[PDB]
Each structure stands twice: as structure tokens, then as C-alpha cells.
Enzyme design. Structure first.
Site, PDB file in Angstrom:
ATOM      1  N   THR A  44       0.769  -1.211  -0.001  1.00  0.00           N
ATOM      2  CA  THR A  44       0.134  -0.061  -0.036  1.00  0.00           C
ATOM      3  C   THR A  44       0.819   1.200  -0.021  1.00  0.00           C
ATOM      4  OG1 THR A  44      -1.411  -1.203   1.287  1.00  0.00           O
ATOM      5  CG2 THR A  44      -1.797   1.171   1.110  1.00  0.00           C
ATOM      6  N   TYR A 107     -13.234  -3.162  -1.489  1.00  0.00           N
ATOM      7  CA  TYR A 107     -14.269  -2.744  -2.167  1.00  0.00           C
ATOM      8  C   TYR A 107     -15.318  -3.681  -2.487  1.00  0.00           C
ATOM      9  CZ  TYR A 107     -16.765  -0.122  -5.682  1.00  0.00           C
ATOM     10  OH  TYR A 107     -18.038   0.161  -6.455  1.00  0.00           O
ATOM     11  N   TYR A 133      -3.304  -9.827   5.047  1.00  0.00           N
ATOM     12  CA  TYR A 133      -3.060  -8.562   5.506  1.00  0.00           C
ATOM     13  C   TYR A 133      -4.317  -8.081   5.732  1.00  0.00           C
ATOM     14  CZ  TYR A 133      -2.086  -3.406   4.407  1.00  0.00           C
ATOM     15  OH  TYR A 133      -1.737  -1.971   4.572  1.00  0.00           O
ATOM     16  N   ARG A 138      -9.197   0.587   5.442  1.00  0.00           N
ATOM     17  CA  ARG A 138      -9.137   0.877   3.807  1.00  0.00           C
ATOM     18  C   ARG A 138      -9.971  -0.099   2.853  1.00  0.00           C
ATOM     19  NH1 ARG A 138      -4.561   3.434   1.751  1.00  0.00           N
ATOM     20  NH2 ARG A 138      -3.673   4.943   3.214  1.00  0.00           N
ATOM     21  N   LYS A 161      -0.315  -9.691   8.361  1.00  0.00           N
ATOM     22  CA  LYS A 161      -0.116  -8.412   8.967  1.00  0.00           C
ATOM     23  C   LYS A 161      -1.288  -7.607   9.376  1.00  0.00           C
ATOM     24  CE  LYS A 161       1.076  -4.063   6.433  1.00  0.00           C
ATOM     25  NZ  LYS A 161       1.419  -3.089   5.300  1.00  0.00           N
ATOM     26  N   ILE A 203       5.708  -4.488   9.893  1.00  0.00           N
ATOM     27  CA  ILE A 203       5.637  -4.275   8.467  1.00  0.00           C
ATOM     28  C   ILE A 203       5.505  -2.611   8.489  1.00  0.00           C
ATOM     29  CG2 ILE A 203       4.615  -4.550   6.161  1.00  0.00           C
ATOM     30  CD1 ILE A 203       4.456  -7.459   6.906  1.00  0.00           C
TER      31      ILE A 203
END
Lengths: 291, 291
Positions: A44, A107, A133, A138, A161, A203
């Protein structure tokens, strides 16, 4: 296996938006010299969304080349289409990535069983260690701890993550897993805590600009030295905050530009850090002793 | 200009996930026959995320071909990359789409100014009527009323799909635009209300299964008939709820299956509606007289 300070490296860009290959090479060398333990390429923070599939391949290839086997390289290969995630992940494997980082499909909001099938299908299609992740803010979806635990049973799913910044929840996950797969922080603010609680590394966004410091924070936190972890983290705690004054990686790219390390390039719909945040950022960098 | 019930049509798929071209053709004819005023091709409900670039084109091309100019066709061309949004929107123009629907970039969380420049760049790149689409719970970003009103100044930004389901906020947007661009509901549950308050239509999920009834709800709502709008909406109000028991379009694709109009195909990471929701769905369809 992969442990310590794992930078989600920015993708340096020329002013026109083209990848700045020279700056990228220098950043990778600088990270290895400064003590970064591994690099996530095109995550990202590396603007995976605005680089083409061919650009994903070139950035991954270049980081591996420069790294020259000194540290492991993780390739960001997430997509909100299972088929696409398979293709990206296979490409990463073929380029010789050590592992792949895959954000939950964003999304389209799959069900928990959908997330399970998504990752299962990827694991079974490509022989590569895979790191899940989770970043609900987001993506519009939250991979539960229960689904995360189910997935750790799948061969080639070797870690997660966890960017929730929810420490009790991450501890709960670490405890439920009992070592079946790795847990990485994806929240710089709380990473020192998670690692003191058993996480394998961080990370990190902050590691982009404070690689030595973050390498030291991870080392002492992994060693379970609570006081050293507090102390070293304290020195860079404000950076974990200021680097998200606008959506990552907006501030961190600006921060590297103020350090003379990369140019201002950044791809729409992302924009250069808004004028008013620039001075406060330079002050935070000066305070932390970065510049 | 475009008003009424605008179905965000599903993309019918065979069991192996291949696009079911014959079933798609029949749906389009059925919509036209039943009173549907416009079709959005490959929007969220159409599984834009899991269809390739070629398939995006094929689906747009097929819906336009079968529609044969009897009703306007709006192409979903959203992307979280501005470059990619331009390319999709250009292709849509080239195919003869009447307009394009562009969700705000998802996952990468642009700033308000980034959203403005994203859409501004698209508008200036492609001479085609554009319709904004805000759905914060999916995208991780909220395009504010302020930014929407600003973008209404751009010549070919002709509307916005407001999927917040927040009626006071949608009213505020309508009043502030004072006619400069269209507002469409993106929330079936409250669409009737928004239309009574000034929205030009409903870009609807429910219209997939009840094209006739939704056509009428919109018509009377746009005509400002509050009593008929409520009475007609009441008939299909439970549908607006049950079609979201899992993430759209999972439930609507299954409903269409229960009606015998499409097969069960749906592409990972999306999954067929969970068994536990199937009977309640059947019941809702029977109650509403759909089956």
C-alpha cells in the site's frame, strides 16, 4: 521465519510519475546498510494501486536485484479479484520473491467464507509463502481472528499483517495461533507493544524514514526487553503519528523528499502532501533527529 | 437528464464463472419490457472488480447492442487509479455508452483534493457525461457534499450516486447543488424518500428483481406524490433489506437464480449466498409476489 523491521518501501517517482529507478536503488541499499530486515515491495505504501502489472514486476525485480540476497524480499501481490491475485502472486514467485503480502480484497466486501476461499485458492495455486493482510479501514472488510486461525492451517499461509492497531485483539490472535503462523504489526503506533506480546515484526511505514531506529525497536521488542522498547519507540513515537496526517503514503513520500532522498512524484488519485502539513512534518523530522 | 429506475444490472455467470451471455441478453430485454428506465453496466452489482478489461468491454457492448437505443446505458468505469479510470471511461465512450459511473477510488484513500483532481482529470480527458459515486463503507473514503458541489462545476460531471443512505445529508446535497447536477439514490431502502426530496432517480439493486415495481416507485416519487411513493415502496420494502443480508450482489444474484433467470455463477472472492439466507430470501420473494 521473516522477523524484525520490515519496511513497506515507497515507490520513488519522478515528477511526471514515472518510477524513479535510481532513487529506488539507493533506498534499497540505504535500508540494508541501516539495518532494515526485509522489504515489502509494492504494498500500500508502495502505491500498488497506481502501478500497472508490468510496473509491479519491474519494481519487485529491481528490489530483489539490488538486495542481492542480503535480506528477504516480500512482494505485495494483493487484488480484490482472486484470479488477479493468483496472477500477481505467481509473477512474484517467478521473480524469486521470498514471500507475498496479500491484502484482503477491498471494495467488493467478500464474506468471511469468501476471504477463506480467496486465500485458499491462492495458496493452492502458487507454491509461495503467503502473508495475509488485514486493514479494515481501507478495505471495507475485517478478516476475523477466527478466519485468520482457520487460514493458518493452510500450507503456504505463513503469516498475517495486522493493521488494526487493536492490541488486545492482536494478542488474542497470537495466543490462539500458538505459533501456527507469524503475526506482524501493520500499525507503527502500537507495533512495539505487539512485538513485546509475541509478534514477529513490524511491516512498517515509519521504517521508511527511520530504518535504523525501527530496526532497533523491533530487535529489542522481539527480545522482550520492555523498557528498551518503550524508550527507543518513544524517540520516534511522534513520527508514527505525523506520517498519517493525510493518507499513507502521502506524508511519508513528502518526508523522504525533505530528506533529499526521492523526488516529489506520486500518482493520482494520491497527491503531494498538502502545503500546510509540510512545516509540521519538517519539525517532527528535526525533533526526531532525522534531519 | 437520465431519470427514474436505473438498474445496476448483475452480470449473469455460468457455474464456472464464465459470463452467461444469453441470460444477460434476456435480462436486458426483460428490463426494457418491464419499464426500467436505464441500465448501469458493470457497476458494483455487476461485479466490475472480478471482470477483466476485455469482459468489461464485452458486457458494455452486449448491453448496448441488445438495448438498441431504447433506453440510455450507463457504463461503470471506476478504478482507484486515475490513469486506469481514464482508459475505462474512454473505452466506454468508444462503445457508445450514454454516460459513465465512477466510484470514488477505493482502498488507497485519496484526500478531498485528490478526489477533485481525479474526477477533474477524467472529465477533461474524455468527452462523456460522468456520474460520481460515493459509497464510503466500501471504499474507505467519503466524497463530501462540498467536493461534490465543486465537481458539479465541471461541464461533463452530470450527477452523483449517493449511496450513504443518509437522507438529511442527501437533501443538503440536492439543495446546495440547486440543479447543477443530478443526485441519484444509491440506497434502495431510502431511495423513495430521496426522490421525493429532489433526486432524479435510483440506481437500484432491488430493480434487478422488481423492475416494474421500482419503475413505478421512482415515477411517483419523482412526481412528488408522497402517499403513492410510500404505498408503492411498502410493497417491496422488505426486499431492500433482504438483498443486503450478505454483501451485494451476493443476495441479488441468488434471488435472480430463485426466479429462474440466471445460474449460480459468482466470482471469488464473492461466494453464492449462504444456505442460511436462502429460505428467508425465497419467502421475501413469495411475500412480494416475485415468485
Amino acid at each position: 521465519t521473516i522477523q524484525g523491521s520490515i519496511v513497506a518501501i515507497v515507490t520513488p517517482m519522478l515528477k511526471d510519475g514515472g518510477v524513479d529507478w535510481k532513487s529506488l536503488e539507493k533506498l534499497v541499499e540505504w535500508h540494508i546498510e541501516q539495518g532494515t530486515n526485509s522489504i515489502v515491495a509494492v504494498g500500500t505504501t508502495g502505491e500498488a494501486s497506481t502501478l500497472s502489472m508490468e510496473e509491479h514486476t519491474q519494481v519487485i525485480k529491481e528490489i530483489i536485484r539490488v538486495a542481492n540476497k542480503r535480506i528477504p524480499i516480500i512482494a505485495g501481490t494483493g487484488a480484490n479479484s482472486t484470479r488477479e491475485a493468483i496472477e500477481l502472486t505467481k509473477a512474484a514467485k517467478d521473480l524469486g520473491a521470498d514471500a507475498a503480502l496479500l491484502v484482503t480484497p477491498y471494495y467488493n466486501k467478500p464474506t468471511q467464507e469468501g476471504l477463506y476461499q480467496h486465500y485458499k485458492a491462492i495458496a493452492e495455486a502458487v507454491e509461495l509463502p503467503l502473508i495475509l493482510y488485514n486493514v479494515p479501514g481501507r478495505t471495507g472488510v475485517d478478516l476475523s481472528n477466527d478466519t485468520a486461525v482457520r487460514l493458518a492451517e493452510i500450507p503456504n499461509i505463513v503469516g498475517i499483517k495486522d493493521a488494526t492497531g487493536d492490541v488486545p485483539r492482536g494478542k488474542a490472535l497470537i495466543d490462539a495461533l500458538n505459533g501456527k503462523m507469524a503475526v506482524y504489526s501493520g500499525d507503527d503506533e502500537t507495533a512495539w507493544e505487539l512485538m513485546l506480546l509475541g509478534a514477529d515484526g513490524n511491516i512498517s511505514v515509519t521504517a521508511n524514514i527511520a530504518p535504523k531506529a525501527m530496526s532497533e525497536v523491533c530487535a529489542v521488542a522481539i527480545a522482550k526487553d520492555e523498557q528498551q522498547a518503550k524508550t527507543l519507540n518513544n524517540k520516534i513515537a511522534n513520527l508514527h503519528n505525523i506520517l498519517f496526517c493525510e493518507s499513507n503514503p502521502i506524508p511519508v513520500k513528502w518526508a523522504l523528499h525533505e530528506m533529499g532522498l526521492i523526488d516529489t512524484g506520486i500518482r493520482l488519485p494520491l497527491t503531494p502532501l498538502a502545503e500546510q502539513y509540510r512545516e509540521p512534518l519538517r519539525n517532527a523530522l528535526k525533533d526526531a533527529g532525522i534531519i
